[PDB]
Amino acid sequence: GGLSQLVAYGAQDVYLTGNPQITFFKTVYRRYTNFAIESIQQTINGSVGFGNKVSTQISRNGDLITDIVVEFVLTKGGNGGTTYYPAEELLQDVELEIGGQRIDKHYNDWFRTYDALFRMNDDRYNYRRMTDWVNNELVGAQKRFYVPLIFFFNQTPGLALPLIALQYHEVKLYFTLASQVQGVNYNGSSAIAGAAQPTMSVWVDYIFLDTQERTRFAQLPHEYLIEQLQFTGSETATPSATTQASQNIRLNFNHPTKYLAWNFNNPTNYGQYTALANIPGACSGAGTAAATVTTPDYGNTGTYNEQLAVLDSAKIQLNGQDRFATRKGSYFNKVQPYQSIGGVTPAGVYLYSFALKPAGRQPSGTCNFSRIDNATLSLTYKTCSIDATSPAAVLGNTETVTANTATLLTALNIYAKNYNVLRIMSGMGGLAYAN
């Protein structure tokens, strides 16, 4: 039996089991702090609606804050396949302020980028379950949606907001609710008569501490190492024919940065980062005589077919000098997610990391743009020569071309996720680094 290999002990084993330090079969657990988690609703300031701005002040109903989830009630203004993460689109943005200083801001397009890169396996599918209709629901169906927020403190309790230590500060989330919600308010670009306004409520999970911990947090100063998202929108240079366009993008980032991520977006079709084509699930009506490549099959907006992507190659320069040798678009879509995250990213979403484990929080390598005078992202496009309506030409072509419909990805979105430090003392808080 097992004694066969147990006593089959030799020189090659000394560095494995000599002078043992641990035993795998006797675990020691740590005794922890007494706490409880509670979900309550917040006070929603402003009129909830499409295109309106709503502010939620986080009521000080606990010692530490960790999970915040925004819920919405929406109805379908169309039948199955006409929606694409309506609750994720609706939440056009949220920004966090403490004491009136902006700490972070996330955008609906960012949420897509994050879902495309960092949320993976079952959590991505269940995520969609919280934000979309995934069971072929028909017009008139009503669904309650949940959009968990992804601020620096929203994935781990270890960065919970120490409101107990912020006796003099208000913490607020300012929400912008989209005027354009695909499959609820508009079918394509055509208004859907009678669509109802959303009903929204924001939920916050509060942490209650016991007596001794409550005092420790109330009295002592703290330094939180946190994430921030940096974003400014720009404009793409997608070509017509006979050429491979290129453009040099001027980057305006600061602070140690874990990674740069970006996409090429159709500003009217939420989450569309690729060209449409007469391929099943790649446009509305695909495969039939009714197929059109001007309107997507919205519930299938995301695709993994890189031939519908427009990035041919990209390079980043640091102070004008190449940071790494030129790589092709499929590197940033398929390999960095593989090396750095371990998930799958759909076509049209791109990542370049500076960090060994950007999905984690322990710093593992950063590019500090606060000391980089000139940061440039060079983008080379595929030639958009293929007639999108003929799948024989789209599914039967090479690396350097894509479909004519690709010229709709006119919006360029460059994201950077950086580190900062949130310093809190004497009931007051603020950022350590500003630039």
Binding site: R60, N61, G100, H169, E170, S426, G427
Partner: protein, 63 residues
């Protein structure tokens, strides 16, 4: 920026106890047939229900 000394998280006056806490009071008062004892011991029963405090000192620089 906002002076709100208290959090407002049901801490301050809220006595969250399971009614088995009554045994804790019996041990302190020694006698268990407290169906009637609390009626003749009002002053002590009220004292056992009031608070203790911790303070959060900070000093700032004057100008």
């Amino acid at each position: 920026f906002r002076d709100t000394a208290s959090i407002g998280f049901s801490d301050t006056h809220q006595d969250e106890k399971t009614l088995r806490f009554l045994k804790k009071q019996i041990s302190q008062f020694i006698k268990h047939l407290k169906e009637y004892y609390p009626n003749n011991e009002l002053t002590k029963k009220l004292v056992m229900k009031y608070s203790d405090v911790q303070l959060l000192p900070y000093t700032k620089g004057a100008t």
